[PDB]
Design a protein around this ligand. Structure first.
Ligand SMILES: Nc1ncnc2c1ncn2[C@@H]1O[C@H](COP(=O)(O)OP(=O)(O)NP(=O)(O)O)[C@@H](O)[C@H]1O
Length: 240
């Protein structure tokens, strides 16, 4: 119902990607226009990249730049539910999404479903495939998923008509880094010498994971010494 609060303006970097998702955005705003023209869209987009680059953020950003709903689910939860239930819910997810088109359905950790872990997995994988093939030419709704290793994902998830469009996403740029830091740093008493702008400027190649431990780690070094604030030194030290 309520579109996200994130747009391509709040996503540092990923230029090459944002462009590719332009087409998807155009279709979620005017699904009738793309209908009239006799044009088709992939309807299955797998964002490819390493853990901690903000793939879900960009995904959520697509639903927001088109002011359309961002319906989410966890591929992992499904596989964790009694055999049959995980599938039942995949059935639900899409039956609800049909009722809120146009929209984006983000299946988180699609690797939980596509990668040979299992009765649950297989019943959840099968139900997802049918659901994605259960789409009509007039079905405004694009399914997005995220993964790091597309190679070992059941080939069926990638057959035309399903997740037949992939977009690579590299580690964040100095800004994407400054952002992740500023976030996690929330609730962490920093000293006056902490230059998060500079911290980001010197951790190239870092992913949201590396940038989250550095703070946590720098949090302990200071806690253990019983200091009330993380300083730029703790930060430099935590980095390695
Ligand atoms: N490129 C970026 N620009 C601005 N903020 C970002 C960026 N990448 C990540 N973030 C921030 O990190 C938070 C996590 O975003 P999310 O999409 O859930 O990424 P993730 O959980 O780190 N990793 P992934 O498994 O690759 O999706 C968001 O609240 C963002 O503010």
């Amino acid at each position: 119902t309520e579109a996200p609060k994130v747009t391509f303006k709040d996503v540092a970097g990923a230029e090459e990607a944002k462009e590719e998702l332009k087409e998807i955005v155009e279709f979620l705003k005017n699904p009738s226009r793309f209908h009239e023209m006799g044009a088709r869209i992939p309807k299955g987009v797998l964002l490819v990249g390493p853990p901690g680059v903000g793939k879900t953020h960009l995904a959520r950003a697509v639903a927001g730049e088109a002011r359309v709903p961002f319906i989410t689910a966890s591929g992992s939860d499904f596989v964790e539910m009694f055999v049959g239930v995980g599938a039942a819910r995949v059935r639900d997810l899409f039956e609800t999404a049909k009722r809120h088109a146009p929209c984006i359905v983000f299946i988180d950790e699609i690797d939980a479903v596509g990668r040979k872990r299992n009765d649950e997995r297989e019943q959840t994988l099968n139900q997802l495939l049918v659901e994605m093939d259960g789409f009509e030419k007039d079905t405004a709704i694009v399914v997005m998923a995220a993964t790091n290793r597309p190679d070992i994902l059941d080939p069926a998830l990638l057959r035309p008509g399903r997740f037949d469009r992939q977009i690579a996403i590299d580690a964040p740029d100095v800004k994407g880094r400054e952002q992740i830091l500023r976030i996690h740093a929330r609730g962490k008493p920093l000293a006056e010498d902490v230059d998060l702008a500079l911290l980001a400027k010197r951790t190239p190649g870092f992913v949201g994971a590396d940038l989250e431990n550095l703070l946590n780690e720098a949090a302990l070094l200071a806690a253990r010494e019983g200091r009330r604030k993380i300083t730029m030194k703790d930060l430099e030290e935590a980095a390695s």
